[PDB]
Coordinates of all heavy atoms in Angstrom, one line a residue:
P733 N 0.8 -1.3 0.0 CA 0.0 0.0 0.0 C 0.8 1.2 0.0 O 2.1 1.2 0.6 CB -0.8 -0.1 1.3 CG -0.1 -1.2 2.1 CD 0.4 -2.2 1.1
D734 N 0.3 2.3 -0.6 CA 1.0 3.5 -0.6 C 1.1 4.2 0.7 O 2.0 5.1 0.9 CB 0.4 4.6 -1.6 CG -1.1 4.9 -1.1 OD1 -1.7 4.1 -0.3 OD2 -1.6 6.0 -1.7
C735 N 0.3 3.8 1.7 CA 0.5 4.2 3.1 C 1.8 3.9 3.6 O 2.5 4.6 4.3 CB -0.6 3.8 3.9 SG -2.3 4.4 3.5
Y736 N 2.3 2.7 3.2 CA 3.7 2.3 3.6 C 4.7 3.2 3.1 O 5.7 3.7 3.7 CB 3.9 0.9 3.1 CG 3.3 -0.2 4.0 CD1 3.2 -1.5 3.6 CD2 2.9 0.1 5.3 CE1 2.6 -2.5 4.4 CE2 2.4 -0.8 6.1 CZ 2.2 -2.1 5.7 OH 1.7 -3.1 6.5
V737 N 4.6 3.7 1.8 CA 5.5 4.5 1.2 C 5.6 5.9 1.8 O 6.6 6.5 2.2 CB 5.3 4.6 -0.4 CG1 6.1 5.7 -1.0 CG2 5.8 3.4 -1.0
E738 N 4.4 6.4 2.1 CA 4.2 7.6 2.7 C 4.9 7.7 4.1 O 5.4 8.6 4.6 CB 2.8 8.2 2.8 CG 2.1 8.4 1.4 CD 2.9 9.4 0.6 OE1 3.3 10.4 1.2 OE2 3.0 9.3 -0.6
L739 N 4.5 6.7 5.0 CA 5.1 6.6 6.3 C 6.6 6.4 6.3 O 7.3 7.0 7.0 CB 4.5 5.5 7.1 CG 4.7 4.0 6.8 CD1 5.9 3.5 7.8 CD2 3.5 3.2 7.1
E740 N 7.1 5.6 5.3 CA 8.6 5.6 5.1 C 9.2 6.9 4.8 O 10.2 7.3 5.4 CB 8.9 4.6 4.0 CG 10.4 4.5 3.8 CD 10.8 3.7 2.5 OE1 9.8 3.2 1.9 OE2 12.0 3.7 2.2
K741 N 8.4 7.7 4.0 CA 9.0 9.0 3.6 C 8.9 10.0 4.8 O 9.9 10.7 5.1 CB 8.1 9.6 2.5 CG 8.4 9.0 1.1 CD 7.5 9.8 0.1 CE 7.9 9.2 -1.3 NZ 7.1 9.9 -2.4
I742 N 7.9 9.9 5.7 CA 7.9 10.8 6.8 C 8.9 10.4 7.8 O 9.5 11.4 8.4 CB 6.4 10.9 7.4 CG1 6.0 9.6 8.2 CG2 5.4 11.2 6.3 CD1 4.9 9.7 9.1
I743 N 9.1 9.1 8.1 CA 10.0 8.8 9.1 C 11.5 9.2 8.5 O 12.4 9.6 9.2 CB 10.0 7.4 9.4 CG1 8.7 7.1 10.0 CG2 11.0 6.9 10.4 CD1 8.5 5.7 10.5
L744 N 11.7 9.1 7.2 CA 13.0 9.4 6.6 C 13.2 11.0 6.7 O 14.4 11.5 7.1 CB 13.0 9.1 5.1 CG 13.8 7.9 4.8 CD1 15.4 8.2 5.1 CD2 13.4 6.8 5.6
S745 N 12.1 11.7 6.5 CA 12.2 13.2 6.7 C 12.5 13.5 8.3 O 13.3 14.5 8.6 CB 10.9 13.9 6.2 OG 9.9 13.5 7.1
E746 N 11.9 12.7 9.1 CA 12.1 13.1 10.5 C 13.5 12.6 11.0 O 14.1 13.2 12.0 CB 11.1 12.2 11.4 CG 10.8 12.8 12.7 CD 11.9 12.5 13.8 OE1 12.5 11.5 13.6 OE2 12.0 13.3 14.8
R747 N 14.1 11.7 10.2 CA 15.5 11.2 10.7 C 16.5 12.5 10.8 O 17.4 12.5 11.7 CB 16.1 10.3 9.7 CG 17.4 9.8 10.0 CD 17.9 8.7 9.2 NE 17.4 7.4 9.4 CZ 17.5 6.3 8.9 NH1 18.3 6.2 7.7 NH2 16.9 5.1 9.3
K748 N 16.4 13.5 9.9 CA 17.2 14.7 10.0 C 16.8 15.6 11.1 O 17.3 16.6 11.3 CB 17.3 15.4 8.7 CG 16.1 16.2 8.3 CD 16.4 17.1 7.1 CE 15.2 18.0 6.7 NZ 14.5 18.6 8.0
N749 N 15.6 15.3 11.9 CA 15.0 16.2 12.8 C 14.8 15.4 14.1 O 13.7 15.5 14.7 CB 13.8 16.8 12.3 CG 13.9 17.5 10.9 OD1 14.9 18.0 10.6 ND2 12.8 17.3 10.2
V750 N 15.9 14.7 14.5 CA 15.8 13.9 15.8 C 16.9 14.2 16.5 O 18.1 14.5 16.0 CB 15.6 12.4 15.5 CG1 16.9 11.8 15.0 CG2 15.1 11.7 16.7
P751 N 17.0 14.3 17.9 CA 18.2 14.7 18.6 C 19.3 13.7 18.5 O 19.1 12.5 18.5 CB 17.7 14.6 20.1 CG 16.2 14.1 20.0 CD 15.8 14.4 18.7
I752 N 20.6 14.2 18.2 CA 21.7 13.3 18.0 C 22.0 12.5 19.3 O 22.3 11.4 19.3 CB 22.8 14.1 17.5 CG1 22.6 14.8 16.2 CG2 24.1 13.3 17.4 CD1 23.6 15.8 15.8
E753 N 21.8 13.2 20.4 CA 22.1 12.5 21.7 C 21.2 11.4 22.0 O 21.6 10.5 22.8 CB 22.3 13.5 22.8
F754 N 19.9 11.4 21.5 CA 19.0 10.4 21.9 C 18.0 10.3 20.6 O 16.9 11.0 20.6 CB 18.2 10.8 23.1 CG 17.8 9.6 23.9 CD1 18.3 9.5 25.2 CD2 17.1 8.5 23.4 CE1 18.0 8.4 26.0 CE2 16.8 7.4 24.2 CZ 17.3 7.4 25.5
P755 N 18.4 9.6 19.6 CA 17.5 9.5 18.4 C 16.3 8.7 18.5 O 15.6 8.5 17.5 CB 18.5 8.9 17.3 CG 19.8 9.2 17.9 CD 19.8 9.0 19.4
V756 N 16.0 8.2 19.7 CA 14.8 7.3 19.9 C 13.6 8.1 19.9 O 13.5 9.3 20.5 CB 15.0 6.5 21.2 CG1 13.8 5.6 21.3 CG2 16.2 5.7 21.1
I757 N 12.5 7.7 19.2 CA 11.2 8.4 19.3 C 10.2 7.5 20.0 O 10.1 6.4 19.9 CB 10.7 8.5 17.8 CG1 11.4 9.7 17.1 CG2 9.2 8.7 17.7 CD1 11.0 9.9 15.6
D758 N 9.5 8.2 20.9 CA 8.5 7.6 21.7 C 7.2 7.3 20.9 O 7.0 7.9 19.8 CB 8.1 8.3 22.9
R759 N 6.3 6.5 21.4 CA 5.1 6.2 20.7 C 4.3 7.5 20.6 O 3.7 7.6 19.4 CB 4.3 5.2 21.4 CG 4.8 3.8 21.3 CD 3.8 2.7 21.7 NE 2.4 3.1 21.1 CZ 2.1 3.1 19.8 NH1 2.9 2.7 18.8 NH2 0.9 3.5 19.5
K760 N 4.1 8.3 21.5 CA 3.4 9.6 21.4 C 3.9 10.5 20.3 O 3.2 11.1 19.6 CB 3.4 10.3 22.7 CG 4.8 10.8 23.2 CD 4.7 11.3 24.6 CE 4.5 10.2 25.7 NZ 4.5 10.9 27.1
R761 N 5.3 10.5 20.1 CA 5.9 11.3 19.1 C 5.5 10.8 17.7 O 5.1 11.5 16.8 CB 7.4 11.3 19.2 CG 7.9 12.4 20.1 CD 7.6 13.8 19.5 NE 8.3 14.0 18.3 CZ 7.8 13.9 17.1 NH1 6.5 13.7 16.9 NH2 8.6 14.1 16.0
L762 N 5.5 9.4 17.5 CA 5.1 8.8 16.3 C 3.6 9.1 15.9 O 3.2 9.3 14.8 CB 5.3 7.5 16.3 CG 5.2 6.6 14.9 CD1 5.9 7.4 13.8 CD2 5.7 5.2 15.0
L763 N 2.8 8.9 17.0 CA 1.3 9.2 16.8 C 1.2 10.8 16.4 O 0.4 11.1 15.6 CB 0.6 9.0 18.1 CG 0.7 7.5 18.5 CD1 -0.2 7.3 19.8 CD2 0.1 6.5 17.4
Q764 N 1.9 11.7 17.1 CA 1.7 13.0 16.7 C 2.2 13.3 15.3 O 1.7 14.1 14.4 CB 2.6 13.9 17.7 CG 2.6 15.4 17.4 CD 3.8 15.9 16.6 OE1 4.7 15.0 16.2 NE2 4.1 17.2 16.5
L765 N 3.2 12.6 14.9 CA 3.7 12.7 13.4 C 2.7 12.2 12.5 O 2.5 12.9 11.5 CB 5.0 11.9 13.2 CG 6.2 12.5 13.8 CD1 7.4 11.4 14.1 CD2 6.9 13.6 12.9
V766 N 2.1 11.0 12.8 CA 1.1 10.6 11.9 C -0.2 11.4 11.9 O -0.9 11.5 10.9 CB 0.7 9.1 12.1 CG1 1.9 8.3 12.2 CG2 -0.1 9.0 13.4
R767 N -0.3 12.2 13.0 CA -1.5 13.1 13.1 C -1.2 14.4 12.3 O -2.2 15.0 11.6 CB -1.8 13.4 14.5 CG -2.5 12.4 15.2 CD -3.1 13.0 16.6 NE -2.1 13.4 17.5 CZ -1.4 12.6 18.4 NH1 -1.9 11.3 18.5 NH2 -0.5 13.1 19.1
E768 N 0.0 14.8 12.2 CA 0.5 16.0 11.5 C 0.1 16.0 10.1 O -0.5 16.9 9.5 CB 1.9 16.3 11.8 CG 2.2 16.9 13.1 CD 3.7 17.0 13.4 OE1 4.4 16.0 13.2 OE2 4.2 18.1 13.8
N769 N 0.4 14.8 9.4 CA 0.2 14.6 8.0 C -1.2 13.9 7.8 O -1.9 13.8 8.9 CB 1.3 13.8 7.4 CG 1.7 12.7 8.3 OD1 0.9 12.0 9.0 ND2 3.1 12.4 8.4
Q770 N -1.5 13.5 6.7 CA -2.9 13.0 6.3 C -2.8 11.5 6.1 O -3.4 11.0 5.1 CB -3.4 13.8 5.1 CG -3.9 15.2 5.3 CD -2.7 16.1 5.7 OE1 -1.6 16.0 5.5 NE2 -3.1 17.1 6.7
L771 N -2.0 10.8 6.9 CA -1.9 9.4 6.7 C -3.2 8.6 7.1 O -4.1 9.2 7.7 CB -0.8 8.8 7.6 CG 0.6 9.2 7.3 CD1 1.6 8.9 8.4 CD2 1.1 8.5 6.0
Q772 N -3.3 7.5 6.4 CA -4.6 6.7 6.5 C -4.5 5.5 7.5 O -5.5 4.6 7.4 CB -5.1 6.3 5.1 CG -5.7 7.4 4.4 CD -4.8 8.6 4.2 OE1 -3.6 8.5 3.9 NE2 -5.4 9.7 4.2
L773 N -3.4 5.2 8.1 CA -3.4 4.1 9.1 C -3.9 4.6 10.4 O -4.1 5.7 10.7 CB -2.0 3.7 9.3 CG -0.8 4.6 9.9 CD1 0.4 3.7 10.2 CD2 -0.5 5.7 9.0
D774 N -4.4 3.6 11.2 CA -4.9 3.8 12.5 C -3.9 3.2 13.6 O -2.8 2.9 13.3 CB -6.3 3.0 12.7 CG -6.2 1.6 12.4 OD1 -5.2 1.1 11.7 OD2 -7.1 0.8 12.9
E775 N -4.4 3.1 14.8 CA -3.6 2.5 16.0 C -3.4 1.1 15.7 O -2.5 0.5 16.4 CB -4.2 2.8 17.3 CG -4.4 4.3 17.6 CD -5.7 4.9 17.1 OE1 -6.2 4.5 16.0 OE2 -6.3 5.7 17.9

């Protein structure tokens, strides 16, 4: 599905916007990211 491609793209874009000292993303951050864009996946 193209939703896979879109989520891969958004995570790739986020990769350059994550703290170097702690590049881990919490679940809430990922949910906020999928809320910011118009993705079609659910929980």
Side-chain angles (χ1 to χ4, degrees), residues 733-752 754-757 759-775:
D734 62 343
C735 294
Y736 281 163
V737 166
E738 296 299 324
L739 70 93
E740 176 190 0
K741 286 183 176 182
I742 70 161
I743 299 185
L744 257 294
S745 63
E746 205 282 335
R747 179 172 283 178
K748 76 165 182 45
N749 311 320
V750 73
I752 297 169
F754 218 122
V756 183
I757 279 180
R759 285 199 39 71
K760 59 183 76 173
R761 275 290 299 103
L762 189 49
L763 302 177
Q764 179 261 7
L765 285 156
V766 309
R767 284 194 297 270
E768 287 171 305
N769 41 39
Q770 285 63 32
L771 291 167
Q772 279 62 34
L773 61 174
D774 62 336
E775 300 89 320

